[PDB]
Amino acid sequence: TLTLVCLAGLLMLLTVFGNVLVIIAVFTSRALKAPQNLFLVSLASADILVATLVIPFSLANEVMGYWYFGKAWCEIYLALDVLFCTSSAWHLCAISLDRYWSITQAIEYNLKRTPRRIKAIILTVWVISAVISFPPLISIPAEPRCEINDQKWYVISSCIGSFFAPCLIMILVYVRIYQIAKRRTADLEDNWETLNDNLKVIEKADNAAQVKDALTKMRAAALDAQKATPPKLEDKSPDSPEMKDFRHGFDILVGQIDDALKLANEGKVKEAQAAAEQLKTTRNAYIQKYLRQNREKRFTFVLAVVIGVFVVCWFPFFFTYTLTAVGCSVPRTLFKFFFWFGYCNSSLNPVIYTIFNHDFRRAFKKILCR
Numbered sequence: 001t002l003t004l005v006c007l008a009g010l011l012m013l014l015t016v017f018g019n020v021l022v023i024i025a026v027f028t029s030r031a032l033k034a035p036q037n038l039f040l041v042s043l044a045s046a047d048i049l050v051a052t053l054v055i056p057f058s059l060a061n062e063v064m065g066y067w068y069f070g071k072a073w074c075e076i077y078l079a080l081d082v083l084f085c086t087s088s089a090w091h092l093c094a095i096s097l098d099r100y101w102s103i104t105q106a107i108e109y110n111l112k113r114t115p116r117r118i119k120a121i122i123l124t125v126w127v128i129s130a131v132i133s134f135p136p137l138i139s140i141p142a143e144p145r146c147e148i149n150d151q152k153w154y155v156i157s158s159c160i161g162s163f164f165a166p167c168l169i170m171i172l173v174y175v176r177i178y179q180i181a182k183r184r185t186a187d188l189e190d191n192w193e194t195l196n197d198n199l200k201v202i203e204k205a206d207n208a209a210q211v212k213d214a215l216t217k218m219r220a221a222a223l224d225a226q227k228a229t230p231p232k233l234e235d236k237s238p239d240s241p242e243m244k245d246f247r248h249g250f251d252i253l254v255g256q257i258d259d260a261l262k263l264a265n266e267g268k269v270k271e272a273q274a275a276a277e278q279l280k281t282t283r284n285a286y287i288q289k290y291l292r293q294n295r296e297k298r299f300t301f302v303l304a305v306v307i308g309v310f311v312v313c314w315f316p317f318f319f320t321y322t323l324t325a326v327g328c329s330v331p332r333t334l335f336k337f338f339f340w341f342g343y344c345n346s347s348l349n350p351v352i353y354t355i356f357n358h359d360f361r362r363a364f365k366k367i368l369c370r
């Protein structure tokens, strides 16, 4: 009934509450690099702009509302509701492009990733997003009963121009990103699995020979693993004590395999598997902390999760809105749900942001207390 008028504005403030916290979190932090911050703050600035200037009207217009103090309100209301979503999609596209270029072009791109360069990128997103939003000689006096003239021709070019094409690209480059990351870690993950497999085989073994062969197996696996670069220690020197801690760790391990190999040949089947558990624990304490993903890999994956919500929130709306050109299915029950679903995308960006990024939780708890 009337309980819902406050809920939407309540969730509308959740964008201000959520995104402004991010706006100032990255605003001035020695940990936050300026290249990435610029993009996450203009994205959070579009969300904080649409939650205030466009969000509330959609609720009243949805129940007991019409354009007041002129249709000019219905002019800008349409124009910003496309602008933010065309710019938000295109921003996610550019971060998608930034993440790809950084992972591949390496030193050269870092030289060109000047904060001024990426500042220029954002303004251009606003520029080109304003072109897709501005209609040529076509308007989106008395009350007009605010909706969008569903010109089948224009609508789809804009429907694609706002959501489809930018989302398509950002999906298309991130699938290349995933394949690259999977290729790097592949061989090492072979080894780590082979270690774990032979370990369980050791604990799940009944005779000494089975253990001895399992042990000899992992011995090569560890040596093969010893020559990889673990994910955290990517682009670090072998002068870095972390990269050396990795190596010493597999020396220490190999030795323990050999010592456990002496027990299996001595005929002490039980002592062997016992000592094999000691191998496992040692491996975890030495190695596990380096299998964790690098600092740049976290940012790329976390924005992979963000594209997951831009697709999940907006695709139902745009796909049902695109189908209206052929008018196949029920809009009455679905339009309302999908119009909100796409809209909550702006409030839920800092939600996934702190839910996954380790720097986010601390930046959220330290922004408030100061």
Ligand SMILES: CC(C)N1c2cccc(F)c2C[C@H]1c1cnc[nH]1
Pocket (backbone or CB within 6 Å): 078, 081, 082, 083, 085, 086, 148, 158, 159, 162, 163, 317, 339, 340, 342, 343
């Ligand atoms: C105004 C409606 C039709 N919308 C629109 C129009 C053009 C581009 C575009 F990306 C969007 C999103 C969608 C919408 C805005 N607010 C909630 N849903």
